[PDB]
Amino acid sequence: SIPLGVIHNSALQVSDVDKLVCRDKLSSTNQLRSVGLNLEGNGVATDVPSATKRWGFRSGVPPKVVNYEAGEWAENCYNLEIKKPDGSECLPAAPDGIRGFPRCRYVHKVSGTGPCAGDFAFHKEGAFFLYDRLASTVIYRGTTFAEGVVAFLILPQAKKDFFSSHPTTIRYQAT
Amino acid sequence: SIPLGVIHNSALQVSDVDKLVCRDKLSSTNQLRSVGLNLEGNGVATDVPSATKRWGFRSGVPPKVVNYEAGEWAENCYNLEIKKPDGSECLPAAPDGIRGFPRCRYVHKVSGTGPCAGDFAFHKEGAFFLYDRLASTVIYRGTTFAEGVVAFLILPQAKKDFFSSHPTTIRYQAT
Amino acid sequence: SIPLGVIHNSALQVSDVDKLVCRDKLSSTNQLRSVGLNLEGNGVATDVPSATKRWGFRSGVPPKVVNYEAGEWAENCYNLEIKKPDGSECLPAAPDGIRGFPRCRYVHKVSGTGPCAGDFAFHKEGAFFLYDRLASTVIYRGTTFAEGVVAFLILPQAKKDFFSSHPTTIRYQAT
Amino acid sequence: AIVNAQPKCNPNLHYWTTQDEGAAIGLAWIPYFGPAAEGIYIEGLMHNQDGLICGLRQLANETTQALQLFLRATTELRTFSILNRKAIDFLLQRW
Amino acid sequence: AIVNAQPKCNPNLHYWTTQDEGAAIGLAWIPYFGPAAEGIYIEGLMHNQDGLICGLRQLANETTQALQLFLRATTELRTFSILNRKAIDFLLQRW
Amino acid sequence: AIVNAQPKCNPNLHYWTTQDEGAAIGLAWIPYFGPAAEGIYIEGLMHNQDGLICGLRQLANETTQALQLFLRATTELRTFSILNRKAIDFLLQRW
Numbered sequence: 001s002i003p004l005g006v007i008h009n010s011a012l013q014v015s016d017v018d019k020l021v022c023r024d025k026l027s028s029t030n031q032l033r034s035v036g037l038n039l040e041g042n043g044v045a046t047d048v049p050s051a052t053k054r055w056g057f058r059s060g061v062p063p064k065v066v067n068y069e070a071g072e073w074a075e076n077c078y079n080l081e082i083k084k085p086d087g088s089e090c091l092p093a094a095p096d097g098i099r100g101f102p103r104c105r106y107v108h109k110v111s112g113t114g115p116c117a118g119d120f121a122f123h124k125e126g127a128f129f130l131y132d133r134l135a136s137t138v139i140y141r142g143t144t145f146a147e148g149v150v151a152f153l154i155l156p157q158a159k160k161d162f163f164s165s166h167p168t169t170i171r172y173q174a175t
Numbered sequence: 176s177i178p179l180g181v182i183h184n185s186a187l188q189v190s191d192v193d194k195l196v197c198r199d200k201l202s203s204t205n206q207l208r209s210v211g212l213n214l215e216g217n218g219v220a221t222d223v224p225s226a227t228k229r230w231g232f233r234s235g236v237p238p239k240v241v242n243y244e245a246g247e248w249a250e251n252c253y254n255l256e257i258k259k260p261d262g263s264e265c266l267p268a269a270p271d272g273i274r275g276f277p278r279c280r281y282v283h284k285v286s287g288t289g290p291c292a293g294d295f296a297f298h299k300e301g302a303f304f305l306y307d308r309l310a311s312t313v314i315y316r317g318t319t320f321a322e323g324v325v326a327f328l329i330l331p332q333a334k335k336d337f338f339s340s341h342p343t344t345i346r347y348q349a350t
Numbered sequence: 351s352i353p354l355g356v357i358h359n360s361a362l363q364v365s366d367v368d369k370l371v372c373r374d375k376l377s378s379t380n381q382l383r384s385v386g387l388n389l390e391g392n393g394v395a396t397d398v399p400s401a402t403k404r405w406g407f408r409s410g411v412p413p414k415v416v417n418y419e420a421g422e423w424a425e426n427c428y429n430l431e432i433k434k435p436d437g438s439e440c441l442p443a444a445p446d447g448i449r450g451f452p453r454c455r456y457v458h459k460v461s462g463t464g465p466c467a468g469d470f471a472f473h474k475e476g477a478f479f480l481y482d483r484l485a486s487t488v489i490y491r492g493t494t495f496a497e498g499v500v501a502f503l504i505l506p507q508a509k510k511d512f513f514s515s516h517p518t519t520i521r522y523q524a525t
Numbered sequence: 526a527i528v529n530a531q532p533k534c535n536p537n538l539h540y541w542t543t544q545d546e547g548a549a550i551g552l553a554w555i556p557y558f559g560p561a562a563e564g565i566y567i568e569g570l571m572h573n574q575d576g577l578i579c580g581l582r583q584l585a586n587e588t589t590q591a592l593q594l595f596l597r598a599t600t601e602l603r604t605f606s607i608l609n610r611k612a613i614d615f616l617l618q619r620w
Numbered sequence: 621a622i623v624n625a626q627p628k629c630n631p632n633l634h635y636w637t638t639q640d641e642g643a644a645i646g647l648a649w650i651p652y653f654g655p656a657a658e659g660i661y662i663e664g665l666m667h668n669q670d671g672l673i674c675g676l677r678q679l680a681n682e683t684t685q686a687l688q689l690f691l692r693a694t695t696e697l698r699t700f701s702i703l704n705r706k707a708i709d710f711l712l713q714r715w
Numbered sequence: 716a717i718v719n720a721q722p723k724c725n726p727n728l729h730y731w732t733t734q735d736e737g738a739a740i741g742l743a744w745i746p747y748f749g750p751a752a753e754g755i756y757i758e759g760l761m762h763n764q765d766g767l768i769c770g771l772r773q774l775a776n777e778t779t780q781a782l783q784l785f786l787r788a789t790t791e792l793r794t795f796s797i798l799n800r801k802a803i804d805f806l807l808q809r810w
């Protein structure tokens with residue numbers, strides 16, 4: 001029951017695949033797109049102290065990953081290298097294929113010795129962590145990520161593609 | 176060539192996709208389901224001395240895995256830790272995603288100095304090994320499994336899903 | 351924009367699905383096939399001194415793999431074990447699933463030191479490296495491969511498939 | 526069509542499956558608050574419906590041969606697309 | 621239809637995406653000569669069209685609940701087939 | 716339609732496709748008894764059919780450009796869905 005959006009004459013409306021009339025014609029498989037939107041645009045605070053308080057550790061839930069094709073510029077992105085007091089690395093190492101968010105104006109790198117208390121780090125408000133083009137539910141060590149959400153669309157058939165219109169870093173401690 | 180089952184009027188028939196009349200109307204992708212059933216229901220003996228004679232070691236055949244969505248309760252389940260005499264572990268380590276069988280009334284833990292003389296352990300009668308929701312052709316170390324087989328179905332269209340109706344361990348040595 | 355080849359009356363023509371009229375209709379998903387062809391049939395030189403000049407090293411480009419279902423016999427195949435002068439391995443270890451080309455009438459083993467200057471070895475002319483039934487853009491260590499390209503086809507419908515019709519090595523020093 | 530040949534056939538079927546439709550209670554959909562991997566299943570019973578359960582057990586016994594040969598050909602380590610392929614083959618036959 | 625219920629919604633959208641058909645300028649299609657992983661993107665701006673951008677942001681907020689539960693069920697580690705499934709489910713409903 | 720431009724074109728083609736629906740003997744379908752990975756292939760010769768084999772080689776030389784630009788875009792490490800997507804696009808365009 002994943003909602004799917006339909007665009008006609010630059011208006012947006014929700015539609016189950018069953019509700020589609022013949023008017024909202026879907027002719028080719030390249031009309032279907034997935035877009036990942038950073039939630040900085042929804043007014044959230046983006047400083048490191050406020051962002052750290054929205055990530056938490058848990059055990060017993062396996063990670064998951066989903067693909068997204070288009071994205072958005074991020075004004076702030078994060079990079080985490082937290083450690084346990086004994087020197088062990090808390091977060092998992094990045095699996096092959098996950099590189100990092102392609103576009104960030106600023107990248108916050110956080111390193112410290114705050115005690116993690118679980119197997120993985122999740123998002124307490126349900127949002128995803130966005131990498132180059134793979135959205136994940138977990139934080140991976142050393143890889144830049146941007147907080148965001150994913151949406152699915154049926155784009156209009158046109159001679160020009162929908163996605164063709166008008167074509168620093170700081171380090172802080174933690175505990 | 177994989178047979179596909181169709182349910183109508185609470186009866187089961189075999190019909191490849193070629194023979195489907197419009198009467199057995201497939202309407203949405205939710206109707207297609209894969210079900211994994213255990214051998215215990217077909218009358219097979221399940222004491223450990225009889226179970227181990229039904230698995231054998233071989234080399235030169237890559238392992239394979241297939242997904243299955245629904246399953247059955249298992250009264251007997253097996254966990255294996257076999258070592259060749261020098262102390263090396265014979266069975267492969269479980270890859271990421273493989274996980275124990277969810278529901279198991281009793282779990283037999285078997286460990287001992289087997290003469291295992293192959294690269295992988297296979298089923299000598301063609302049955303799969305059921306792990307979580309992944310059916311495998313090979314045994315993995317330390318993960319519970321139940322012997323079973325997989326079936327494919329086209330479920331009836333209804334207001335209530337078909338799979339919604341009426342909603343200890345022992346340690347033994349081996350060689 | 352990947353072309354499809356359509357066969358009718360033992361003639362071949364290019365026809366994307368945009369213009370695949372009913373005269374060349376599909377009926378089942380087993381008609382679609384992918385065929386991997388070797389460069390040696392197109393007249394390329396195959397002696398080792400001339401073959402190595404068409405492979406080169408680069409960094410910053412992720413490797414990729416694509417599946418192909420049909421193939422061709424190779425008169426010459428290659429196996430590589432290059433090393434840096436310090437003794438380290440120059441090429442990636444083969445990931446699980448890569449098993450080497452199944453049919454080679456002769457296999458060249460090339461093993462010697464070379465000033466490797468990149469993460470991976472690519473093909474300078476855009477060709478793929480054919481491993482078993484997987485086509486890769488990068489050379490893996492110790493696995494036989496044949497240089498080739500991939501083509502996609504819509505086979506004719508018949509009682510007898512398009513296929514099934516009419517049913518050693520040297521070592522070379524390097525520097 | 527199908528007829529049971531096994532020496533014994535258990536008529537009941539205690540099943541478990543994972544539901545993905547609908548909405549959860551409050552915050553339960555957030556992974557940080559949701560249940561562990563051992564608590565995502567739902568369970569039921571096809572009480573005393575022997576006429577159908579006996580058929581499933583026999584079909585699974587016969588389906589193994591075709592499935593094993595299919596997995597031999599494929600070079601994908603984990604297969605998830607068998608049902609999708611059959612959906613496509615259904616459409617292409619009556620397009 | 622969709623109405624935003626979130627503070628300080630951003631009207632603009634500086635997108636980036638990968639062009640599937642590629643540029644194909646001369647030899648640039650060969651990976652040994654092509655751009656690095658950081659250079660395969662194209663980017664623009666959907667200027668001041670807040671009537672559509674505001675809708676997209678709200679849809680993503682609501683789509684999260686359904687997507688999370690779906691991922692909880694599937695046993696595959698990386699999911700790529702959501703759109704293809706919706707393409708099949710569109711066809712199967714049409715007669 | 717297609718015209719060969721390569722300096723030489725071999726007219727014969729030996730193939731080694733695998734078979735998914737073979738009529739296996741009683742016990743050959745069990746992996747414990749079946750052939751090793753080197754024995755699952757079937758071989759044959761498309762004798763002297765120059766008119767098709769020459770065209771087939773040329774099409775491959777032209778499909779590399781489109782295929783590699785496609786692989787540059789995808790995040791998948793291994794791609795298996797190219798033919799399935801083309802099947803879906805065939806059905807959708809019959810609108």
Ligand SMILES: *[C@@H]1O[C@H](CO)[C@@H](O[C@@H]2O[C@H](CO)[C@@H](O[C@@H]3O[C@H](CO)[C@@H](O)[C@H](O)[C@@H]3O)[C@H](O)[C@H]2NC(C)=O)[C@H](O)[C@H]1NC(C)=O
Binds near residue numbers: 301302586
């Ligand atoms: C599907 O069900 C049939 C019927 O139950 C299963 O057939 C069984 O196959 C095994 C292995 O070939 C037979 O074992 C053999 O039995 C005799 C002694 O009875 C002996 O010659 C051999 O040493 C061997 O053990 C077994 O008898 C046979 N069962 C019956 C009732 O005929 C079949 O295995 C099932 N298929 C799958 C994939 O589970």
Ligand SMILES: *[C@@H]1O[C@H](CO)[C@@H](O[C@@H]2O[C@H](CO)[C@@H](O[C@@H]3O[C@H](CO)[C@@H](O)[C@H](O)[C@@H]3O)[C@H](O)[C@H]2NC(C)=O)[C@H](O)[C@H]1NC(C)=O
Binds near residue numbers: 127149625627681
């Ligand atoms: C989708 O957007 C909604 C808003 O439309 C987001 O709701 C936000 O939910 C969080 C909790 O998950 C709320 O935090 C709570 O706020 C109050 C502040 O007084 C307080 O009672 C609690 O201490 C707690 O912090 C937050 O206020 C709420 N935002 C708004 C604007 O109401 C929701 O998180 C978004 N969903 C996703 C997946 O991003």
Ligand SMILES: *[C@@H]1O[C@H](CO)[C@@H](O[C@@H]2O[C@H](CO)[C@@H](O[C@@H]3O[C@H](CO)[C@@H](O)[C@H](O)[C@@H]3O)[C@H](O)[C@H]2NC(C)=O)[C@H](O)[C@H]1NC(C)=O
Binds near residue numbers: 721
């Ligand atoms: C598809 O087939 C064509 C030929 O039909 C292949 O073109 C060949 O491309 C290579 C590499 O660009 C050319 O090599 C160059 O040739 C000249 C003359 O020696 C020289 O300037 C350079 O040193 C370089 O070696 C080659 O000449 C050309 N072949 C022909 C007959 O023109 C093409 O590579 C094939 N594509 C694939 C993907 O295999």
